[PDB]
């Protein structure tokens, strides 16, 4: 649980 996000794609 909890997805890492490099902020490259939205939503």
């Amino acid at each position: 649980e909890e997805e890492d996000d490099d902020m490259g794609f939205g939503l």
Partner: antibody
Framework: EVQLEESGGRLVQPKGSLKLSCAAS????????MNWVRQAPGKGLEWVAR??????????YYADSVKDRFTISRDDSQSMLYLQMNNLKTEDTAMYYC??????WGQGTLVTVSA | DVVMTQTPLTLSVTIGQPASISCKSS???????????LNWLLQRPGQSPKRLIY???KLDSGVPDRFTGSGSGTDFTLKISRVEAEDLGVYYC?????????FGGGTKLEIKR
């Protein structure tokens, strides 16, 4: 250190099938969305497919050019990302990169679609 | 699909001099959450691409301050204050605001000598 190693590239006949693998290490594979990006020889980059992590129920996305022919999948227990390609066309010839989000890129594996 | 247009196709710059490259979208990249998902990547010869900038203007870690990203809506720009030998390569813009995630055609930066 972060490492992504793609395996499986090779020569295949038009209409043929091929499965690519990507082995991930040095980061938390199971909490990351992964992508496949390809580049035809001497051409630009083209996004192919995306798979989210287990928290987002492994949602999948595909470019129109590969939708229904390609299947993106993962094996979290083995830190593996896959790309199954069916009914291959000469336009599918490219270097295929495994990508963590938009930031960590593998060295790529070459797929040559030819008679 | 959102069409990403990069100009110029190629440029030739002397080491120490500035460079400026453009990325224009067929529709606004301002997303529903008020953020603009515009990324800039560099692919050096015989190497894999690497991300330099995200969210129009944010620098990834280890990217020198010589790079600046700017713009809004449909018009975006990457600027290099003083080019170094290591900046040689092809620069791509990649939008993540609208599905499918489309790339610009690339701008090849060459070293003038």
């Amino acid at each position: 250190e972060v490492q992504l190693e793609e395996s499986g590239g090779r020569l295949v006949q038009p209409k043929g099938s091929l499965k690519l693998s990507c082995a991930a290490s040095g980061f938390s594979f199971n909490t990351n969305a992964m992508n496949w990006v390809r580049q035809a020889p001497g051409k630009g980059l083209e996004w192919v497919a995306r798979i989210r992590s287990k928290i987002n129920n492994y949602s999948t996305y595909y470019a129109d050019s590969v939708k229904d022919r390609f299947t993106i999948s993962r094996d979290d227990s083995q830190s593996m990302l896959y790309l199954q390609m069916n009914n291959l066309k000469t336009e599918d010839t490219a270097m295929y990169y495994c990508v963590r989000g938009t930031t960590y890129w593998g060295q790529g594996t070459l797929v040559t679609v030819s008679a | 699909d959102v069409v990403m247009t990069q100009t110029p196709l190629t440029l030739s710059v002397t080491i120490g001099q500035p460079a400026s490259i453009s990325c224009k979208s067929s529709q606004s990249l301002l997303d529903s959450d008020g953020k603009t998902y515009l990324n800039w990547l560099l692919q050096r010869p015989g190497q894999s691409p690497k991300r330099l900038i995200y969210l129009v203007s944010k620098l990834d870690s280890g990217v020198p301050d010589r790079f600046t990203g700017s713009g809004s809506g449909t018009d975006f720009t990457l600027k290099i204050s003083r080019v170094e030998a290591e900046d040689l390569g092809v620069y791509y813009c990649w939008q993540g605001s609208h599905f499918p995630y489309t790339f610009g055609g690339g701008t090849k930066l060459e070293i003038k000598r």
